[PDB]
Design a protein around this ligand. Structure first.
Ligand code: BMF
Ligand code: BMF
Ligand code: BR
Ligand code: BR
Lengths: 125, 121
């Protein structure tokens, strides 16, 4: 018996029998949608984010956030050392690369955060 | 958002680091993506459909071209592509990183379109 079909990416049509100026533009828009890192935000309808949030919990084995680390420090039942804390902070960055890819704007943001923490920690001295 | 504890009675190296992580979480623009758990971000989806009158995506434009019952001209197609950028500014503001990304996309399309036509000639 047939299960309902999952959502996915647009299947590209090598050839189309519409107007040439529209067909050309289609091929161009497909490349943008498929290859350009900056298109990530605009590829799919916004309601497909639910689906992506679901895929995140399938892809990333150990999810992590700054909130989760801060709340765990306060609770006092998780972290005995600063190195333990930093392994979770590194994990945020590793998860981000894992899910978003190294070329993504989010990978760049993760890198900025890493060094912004280094700055703040060194300035705390 | 996490309520900051001015003083904590954990180890000094952990406590110092906590204060540092809080500043990152609270003040650093680049931390926005990593502040809260990913499942908290589903909330924004519903607000988007309240704010943006005519939502639009690249998927919607691509599927509509293929179907052949929407777009008669290239200018029609581009009005929907422009709409994606107008919606982005509307929802995120002009100064946002996402507004910059929308701008990069506009030009990335210009690049690809010109590389398509110059490739032919
Ligand atoms: C200031 C920070 O605000 C935001 O993060 N804003 C926005 C975020 C996203 C968004 C997130 C994640 C993903 C994976 C996608 N891609 S998808 C599944 O829709 O193809 C889109 N779309 N978006 C659109 C449209 N307009 N604004 C936003
Ligand atoms: C409709 C447009 O509104 C939004 O959905 N906006 C936002 C969306 C997301 C978001 C969702 C899903 C995913 C998978 C990701 N990527 S991540 C950070 O997990 O690597 C991001 N973050 N976000 C943050 C921060 N601030 N706003 C938003
Ligand atoms: Br988390
Ligand atoms: Br849409």
């Amino acid at each position: 018996h047939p299960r309902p079909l999952p959502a996915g990416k647009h299947a590209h049509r090598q050839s189309l029998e519409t107007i040439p100026e529209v067909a050309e533009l289609y091929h161009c828009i497909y490349k943008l949608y498929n290859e350009e890192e900056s298109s990530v935000w605009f590829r799919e309808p916004v309601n497909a984010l639910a689906q992506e949030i679901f895929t995140y919990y399938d892809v990333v084995k150990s999810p992590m956030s700054l909130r989760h680390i801060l709340d765990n420090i306060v609770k006092g039942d998780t972290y005995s050392t600063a190195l333990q804390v930093m392994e979770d902070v590194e994990l945020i960055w590793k998860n981000c690369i894992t899910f978003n890819g190294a070329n993504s704007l989010l990978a760049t943001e993760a890198g900025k955060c890493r060094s912004a923490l280094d700055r703040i920690r060194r300035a705390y001295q």
